[PDB]
């Protein structure tokens, strides 16, 4: 409360660390469904169904331009990519399984990097 401050973690490296995690995401062999925005006019239904599209390049743009207030808003956008993927694709479709794989990969790197 007022004039009573809880110790807060050192967040000085958060930008660099999220950037490094994102780079690893981007280089993963299963990243291809998520590298660029979905072709809004080539994937029928995607525009109406997916209310908040997100993808790695858009996350990179936002990260590079100071559009994430904190590391948690960055994680929200990454998870959004995979939540959207789950909504639209079958679990055992190539794109669906890629999403599950990428999510697992992200959450471990997230835990390992920040859950000190
Ligand atoms: O490459 C794709 C194609 C379709 C969807 C729907 C959510 N994420 C997607 C990624």
Coordinates of N, CA and C and ligand atoms in Angstrom, one line a residue:
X1 N 0.8 -1.2 0.0 CA 0.0 0.0 0.0 C 0.9 1.2 0.0
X2 N 0.3 2.4 0.2 CA 1.0 3.7 0.2 C 2.2 3.7 1.1
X3 N 3.4 3.9 0.5 CA 4.7 3.9 1.3 C 5.0 2.5 1.9
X4 N 4.4 1.5 1.4 CA 4.7 0.1 1.8 C 5.0 -0.7 0.6
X5 N 6.2 -0.9 0.2 CA 6.6 -1.6 -1.1 C 7.1 -3.0 -0.8
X6 N 6.4 -3.9 -1.5 CA 6.9 -5.3 -1.6 C 8.1 -5.4 -2.5
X7 N 9.1 -6.2 -2.1 CA 10.2 -6.4 -3.0 C 9.7 -6.9 -4.4
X8 N 10.2 -6.2 -5.4 CA 9.7 -6.6 -6.8 C 11.0 -7.1 -7.6
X9 N 10.8 -8.2 -8.4 CA 11.9 -8.8 -9.1 C 12.5 -7.8 -10.0
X10 N 13.8 -8.0 -10.3 CA 14.6 -7.2 -11.3 C 14.1 -7.5 -12.7
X11 N 13.4 -6.6 -13.3 CA 12.8 -6.8 -14.6 C 13.7 -6.2 -15.7
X12 N 14.9 -5.8 -15.4 CA 15.7 -5.0 -16.3 C 16.1 -5.9 -17.6
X13 N 16.1 -7.2 -17.5 CA 16.5 -8.1 -18.6 C 15.3 -8.6 -19.4
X14 N 14.1 -8.3 -19.0 CA 12.9 -8.9 -19.5 C 12.7 -8.8 -21.0
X15 N 13.0 -7.6 -21.5 CA 12.8 -7.3 -22.9 C 13.8 -8.2 -23.7
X16 N 15.0 -8.3 -23.3 CA 16.0 -9.1 -24.0 C 15.6 -10.6 -23.9
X17 N 15.2 -11.0 -22.7 CA 14.9 -12.4 -22.5 C 13.7 -12.9 -23.3
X18 N 12.6 -12.0 -23.4 CA 11.5 -12.3 -24.2 C 11.8 -12.3 -25.7
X19 N 12.7 -11.4 -26.1 CA 13.2 -11.4 -27.5 C 13.9 -12.7 -27.8
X20 N 14.7 -13.2 -26.9 CA 15.5 -14.4 -27.1 C 14.5 -15.6 -27.2
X21 N 13.5 -15.7 -26.3 CA 12.5 -16.7 -26.4 C 11.7 -16.7 -27.7
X22 N 11.4 -15.5 -28.1 CA 10.7 -15.3 -29.4 C 11.5 -15.8 -30.6
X23 N 12.8 -15.5 -30.5 CA 13.7 -16.0 -31.6 C 13.7 -17.5 -31.6
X24 N 13.7 -18.2 -30.5 CA 13.7 -19.6 -30.5 C 12.4 -20.2 -31.0
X25 N 11.3 -19.5 -30.7 CA 10.0 -19.8 -31.2 C 10.0 -19.8 -32.8
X26 N 10.6 -18.7 -33.3 CA 10.6 -18.4 -34.7 C 11.5 -19.4 -35.5
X27 N 12.5 -20.0 -34.8 CA 13.4 -20.9 -35.5 C 13.0 -22.4 -35.4
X28 N 12.0 -22.7 -34.5 CA 11.5 -24.0 -34.3 C 10.9 -24.6 -35.6
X29 N 11.2 -25.8 -36.0 CA 10.8 -26.3 -37.3 C 9.2 -26.3 -37.4
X30 N 8.5 -26.3 -36.3 CA 7.1 -26.3 -36.3 C 6.4 -24.9 -36.2
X31 N 7.2 -23.9 -36.4 CA 6.7 -22.5 -36.3 C 5.9 -22.1 -37.5
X32 N 6.1 -22.8 -38.6 CA 5.6 -22.3 -39.9 C 4.1 -21.8 -39.9
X33 N 3.2 -22.4 -39.1 CA 1.8 -21.9 -39.2 C 1.6 -20.5 -38.5
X34 N 2.6 -20.1 -37.8 CA 2.5 -19.0 -36.9 C 3.5 -17.8 -37.2
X35 N 4.2 -17.9 -38.2 CA 5.3 -17.0 -38.5 C 4.7 -15.6 -39.0
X36 N 3.7 -15.7 -39.7 CA 3.0 -14.5 -40.3 C 1.6 -14.5 -40.1
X37 N 0.9 -13.3 -40.3 CA -0.6 -13.4 -40.1 C -1.2 -14.4 -41.0
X38 N -2.3 -15.0 -40.5 CA -3.1 -15.9 -41.3 C -3.6 -15.1 -42.5
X39 N -3.6 -15.7 -43.7 CA -4.1 -15.1 -44.9 C -5.6 -14.9 -44.7
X40 N -6.0 -13.8 -44.2 CA -7.4 -13.5 -43.8 C -8.4 -13.8 -44.9
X41 N -8.0 -13.7 -46.2 CA -8.9 -14.0 -47.3 C -8.6 -15.3 -48.0
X42 N -7.8 -16.2 -47.4 CA -7.5 -17.5 -48.0 C -7.9 -18.6 -47.1
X43 N -8.1 -18.2 -45.8 CA -8.6 -19.2 -44.8 C -10.0 -18.8 -44.4
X44 N -11.0 -19.3 -45.1 CA -12.4 -19.0 -44.9 C -12.8 -19.3 -43.5
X45 N -13.4 -18.2 -42.8 CA -13.9 -18.4 -41.5 C -13.0 -17.7 -40.5
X46 N -11.8 -17.6 -40.8 CA -10.8 -17.2 -39.8 C -11.1 -15.7 -39.3
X47 N -11.5 -14.8 -40.2 CA -11.8 -13.5 -39.8 C -12.9 -13.4 -38.8
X48 N -14.0 -14.1 -39.1 CA -15.2 -14.0 -38.3 C -15.0 -14.7 -37.0
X49 N -14.4 -15.9 -37.0 CA -14.3 -16.8 -35.9 C -13.2 -16.3 -34.9
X50 N -12.0 -16.0 -35.4 CA -10.9 -15.5 -34.5 C -10.9 -14.0 -34.3
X51 N -11.4 -13.6 -33.1 CA -11.7 -12.2 -32.8 C -10.4 -11.4 -32.7
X52 N -9.3 -12.1 -32.1 CA -8.1 -11.4 -31.9 C -6.9 -12.2 -32.5
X53 N -6.7 -12.0 -33.8 CA -5.6 -12.8 -34.5 C -4.3 -12.4 -33.9
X54 N -3.4 -13.3 -33.8 CA -2.0 -13.0 -33.4 C -1.0 -13.9 -34.0
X55 N 0.2 -13.5 -34.2 CA 1.2 -14.3 -34.8 C 2.6 -13.8 -34.4
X56 N 3.6 -14.7 -34.7 CA 5.0 -14.3 -34.2 C 5.5 -13.0 -34.7
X57 N 5.2 -12.7 -36.0 CA 5.8 -11.5 -36.6 C 5.1 -10.2 -36.0
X58 N 3.9 -10.3 -35.7 CA 3.1 -9.2 -35.0 C 3.7 -9.1 -33.6
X59 N 3.9 -10.2 -32.9 CA 4.5 -10.1 -31.6 C 5.9 -9.5 -31.6
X60 N 6.7 -9.9 -32.6 CA 8.0 -9.3 -32.8 C 7.9 -7.8 -33.1
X61 N 7.0 -7.3 -33.9 CA 6.8 -5.9 -34.1 C 6.5 -5.2 -32.8
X62 N 5.5 -5.7 -32.1 CA 5.1 -5.1 -30.8 C 6.2 -5.1 -29.8
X63 N 7.0 -6.1 -29.8 CA 8.2 -6.2 -28.9 C 9.3 -5.2 -29.2
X64 N 9.4 -5.0 -30.5 CA 10.5 -4.1 -31.0 C 10.1 -2.6 -30.9
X65 N 8.8 -2.4 -30.7 CA 8.3 -1.0 -30.7 C 7.7 -0.6 -29.3
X66 N 8.1 -1.3 -28.3 CA 7.7 -1.0 -26.9 C 6.2 -1.0 -26.6
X67 N 5.6 -2.0 -27.2 CA 4.1 -2.1 -27.1 C 3.7 -3.2 -26.1
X68 N 4.7 -3.8 -25.4 CA 4.3 -4.6 -24.3 C 4.8 -3.9 -23.0
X69 N 3.8 -3.6 -22.1 CA 4.1 -2.9 -20.9 C 4.9 -3.8 -19.9
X70 N 4.8 -5.1 -20.0 CA 5.5 -6.0 -19.1 C 5.6 -7.4 -19.7
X71 N 6.3 -8.3 -19.0 CA 6.6 -9.6 -19.6 C 5.3 -10.4 -19.7
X72 N 4.3 -10.2 -18.8 CA 3.1 -10.9 -18.8 C 2.2 -10.6 -20.0
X73 N 2.2 -9.3 -20.4 CA 1.4 -9.0 -21.6 C 2.1 -9.7 -22.9
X74 N 3.4 -9.9 -22.9 CA 4.0 -10.6 -23.9 C 3.6 -12.1 -23.9
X75 N 3.6 -12.7 -22.8 CA 3.1 -14.1 -22.6 C 1.7 -14.3 -23.1
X76 N 0.8 -13.3 -22.8 CA -0.6 -13.4 -23.2 C -0.7 -13.4 -24.7
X77 N 0.1 -12.6 -25.4 CA 0.0 -12.6 -26.8 C 0.6 -14.0 -27.4
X78 N 1.6 -14.5 -26.8 CA 2.1 -15.8 -27.3 C 1.1 -16.9 -27.1
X79 N 0.4 -16.9 -25.9 CA -0.6 -17.9 -25.6 C -1.8 -17.7 -26.6
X80 N -2.1 -16.5 -26.9 CA -3.2 -16.2 -27.8 C -3.0 -16.8 -29.1
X81 N -1.8 -16.8 -29.6 CA -1.5 -17.5 -30.9 C -1.9 -19.0 -30.8
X82 N -1.6 -19.6 -29.7 CA -1.9 -21.1 -29.6 C -3.3 -21.3 -29.2
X83 N -3.9 -20.4 -28.5 CA -5.4 -20.6 -28.2 C -6.2 -20.4 -29.4
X84 N -5.8 -19.5 -30.3 CA -6.5 -19.3 -31.5 C -6.4 -20.5 -32.4
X85 N -5.2 -21.1 -32.4 CA -4.9 -22.3 -33.2 C -5.7 -23.4 -32.8
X86 N -5.9 -23.6 -31.5 CA -6.7 -24.7 -31.0 C -8.2 -24.5 -31.3
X87 N -8.7 -23.3 -31.3 CA -10.1 -23.0 -31.6 C -10.4 -23.4 -33.1
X88 N -9.5 -23.2 -34.0 CA -9.8 -23.3 -35.4 C -9.3 -24.6 -36.0
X89 N -8.3 -25.2 -35.5 CA -7.7 -26.4 -36.1 C -8.0 -27.7 -35.2
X90 N -8.1 -28.8 -35.9 CA -8.2 -30.1 -35.2 C -6.9 -30.5 -34.5
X91 N -7.0 -31.2 -33.4 CA -5.8 -31.5 -32.6 C -4.8 -32.3 -33.4
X92 N -5.2 -33.2 -34.3 CA -4.3 -34.1 -35.0 C -4.1 -33.6 -36.5
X93 N -4.5 -32.4 -36.8 CA -4.2 -31.8 -38.1 C -2.7 -31.4 -37.9
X94 N -2.0 -31.1 -39.1 CA -0.6 -30.7 -39.0 C -0.5 -29.4 -38.2
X95 N -1.4 -28.5 -38.5 CA -1.4 -27.1 -37.9 C -1.7 -27.2 -36.4
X96 N -2.8 -28.0 -36.1 CA -3.2 -28.3 -34.7 C -2.1 -28.8 -33.8
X97 N -1.4 -29.9 -34.3 CA -0.4 -30.5 -33.5 C 0.8 -29.6 -33.4
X98 N 1.1 -28.8 -34.5 CA 2.2 -27.8 -34.4 C 1.9 -26.9 -33.3
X99 N 0.7 -26.5 -33.1 CA 0.3 -25.5 -32.0 C 0.5 -26.1 -30.7
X100 N 0.1 -27.4 -30.5 CA 0.3 -28.0 -29.2 C 1.8 -28.1 -28.9
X101 N 2.6 -28.5 -29.9 CA 4.0 -28.6 -29.8 C 4.7 -27.3 -29.4
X102 N 4.3 -26.2 -30.1 CA 4.9 -24.9 -29.9 C 4.5 -24.4 -28.5
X103 N 3.3 -24.7 -28.1 CA 2.8 -24.2 -26.7 C 3.7 -24.9 -25.6
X104 N 3.8 -26.2 -25.7 CA 4.7 -26.9 -24.8 C 6.1 -26.3 -24.8
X105 N 6.6 -26.1 -25.9 CA 8.0 -25.6 -26.1 C 8.1 -24.2 -25.4
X106 N 7.1 -23.3 -25.6 CA 7.1 -22.0 -25.1 C 7.0 -22.0 -23.5
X107 N 6.0 -22.8 -23.0 CA 5.8 -22.8 -21.6 C 7.0 -23.3 -20.8
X108 N 7.8 -24.2 -21.3 CA 9.0 -24.6 -20.6 C 10.0 -23.5 -20.6
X109 N 10.2 -22.9 -21.8 CA 11.2 -21.8 -21.9 C 10.8 -20.7 -21.0
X110 N 9.5 -20.5 -20.9 CA 8.9 -19.4 -20.0 C 9.2 -19.7 -18.5
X111 N 8.9 -20.9 -18.1 CA 9.1 -21.3 -16.8 C 10.6 -21.3 -16.4
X112 N 11.4 -21.8 -17.3 CA 12.9 -21.9 -17.1 C 13.5 -20.5 -17.0
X113 N 13.0 -19.6 -17.8 CA 13.6 -18.3 -17.9 C 13.3 -17.3 -16.8
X114 N 12.0 -17.4 -16.3 CA 11.5 -16.4 -15.4 C 11.2 -16.9 -14.0
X115 N 10.5 -18.1 -13.9 CA 10.4 -18.7 -12.6 C 11.7 -19.1 -12.1
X116 N 12.5 -18.1 -11.6 CA 13.9 -18.2 -11.4 C 14.5 -19.5 -11.0
Ligands
LIG1 O1 -1.6 -21.1 -40.1 C1 -2.8 -21.0 -39.4 C2 -4.0 -21.2 -40.1 C3 -5.2 -21.1 -39.4 C4 -5.2 -20.7 -38.0 C5 -6.2 -20.5 -37.0 C6 -5.6 -20.1 -35.8 N1 -4.3 -20.1 -36.1 C7 -4.0 -20.4 -37.4 C8 -2.8 -20.6 -38.1

